[PDB]
Amino acid sequence: AVTAQSILEKADEIRFPQDSFQVNVAIRTAAPDHAEDLYRYQVLSKGNENSIVMITEPASERGQAILMKGRDLWVFMPSVSQPIRLSLSQRLTGQVANGDIARANFTGDYHPQLLRNESIDDEDYYVLELTGIDRSVTYQKVLLWVNQSNFRPYKAEFYSVSGRLLKTSRYENFDNILGEMRPTRIIMEDALKSGEVSVLDYSDMKLRDLPDKIFTKDYLKRLE
Structure with missing residues (x-):
């Protein structure tokens, strides 16, 4: 049987390799009358354990x-x-939280439960309610739509510590990368009043050995 836990695992494994990897992220945020400069990051991701951004x-x-x-x-x-x-x-840039770039996976940070199933056209989705394990994870509550056919993440709704909708995301631009069709674009939209939309594009994803010993303040003492 499919379980909420297995659905979430499957969606996580489509989003990213369940392994140590590097990826580049470009984030373009705009609102009708105000655009941000482009931001770009290099991410060294070691699950939800360690990362460098x-x-x-x-x-x-x-x-x-x-x-x-x-x-x-x-x-x-x-x-x-x-x-x-x-x-x-806390906020990275635009509609992107630090955990949206620094974390790898929902599994381990959220307890999943099926809230409902939804049909949007000839496609059926599991709607998982993800409850944050504690107040240090990125969100207190996320609703995640997962396609029933192939477990792809479809969209999400992110809620405040008091249950207010804060923003939504959509997963787009799927490409064959490292064993899966993975989304290479995520669009994060403010649910409140700013009009901001942040478009995150992922490129040059590659597996990389990330020793525990790089995850230190000394490794990051740089000046270029």
């Missing part, structure tokens, strides 16, 4: 880095010699 553009931000160990983030900034702490749930 390095900003490459814009130039004003280049060189900042985020080190994740467990649920804790250390952020390296030019105004301080030692890194500082931000949370997974």
Whole structure:
């Protein structure tokens, strides 16, 4: 039988390899009367265990880095010699939270339960309610639509600590990468008043050995 846990696992394994990898992420945010400069990042992803997110553009931000160990983030900034702490749930840029780039998987961070099934045309979806295990994960509640036919993630709704809809995402531009048809675009839309939409494009995904010993403040002591 399919279970909520297995559905979530399958969707996670479509989104990303369940392995250590590198990927580039370009994030373009705009709202009708205001656009952001393009942001680009290189991500070294080791599940939900460890990651490094390095900003490459814009130039004003280049060189900042985020080190994740467990649920804790250390952020390296030019105004301080030692890194500082931000949370997974805090804002990266636009409609993107730190955890949206730094985490790999929903599994382990959320307890899944089937909320309902939905048909949107000739396609049926499982709608999973993902309850955050605790207040340090990225969200307290996510609703995730997973295609029943192939377990692909379809869209998500992200809720506040008090149950207000904050934003929505859509998974798009599926391509054959490392054993799966994986989404290479995610669109994150504000559900509130800003009019912002952030478009995240993933490129050059590749498996990479990421030793535990790179996930340290010393590894990130750089100046270019």
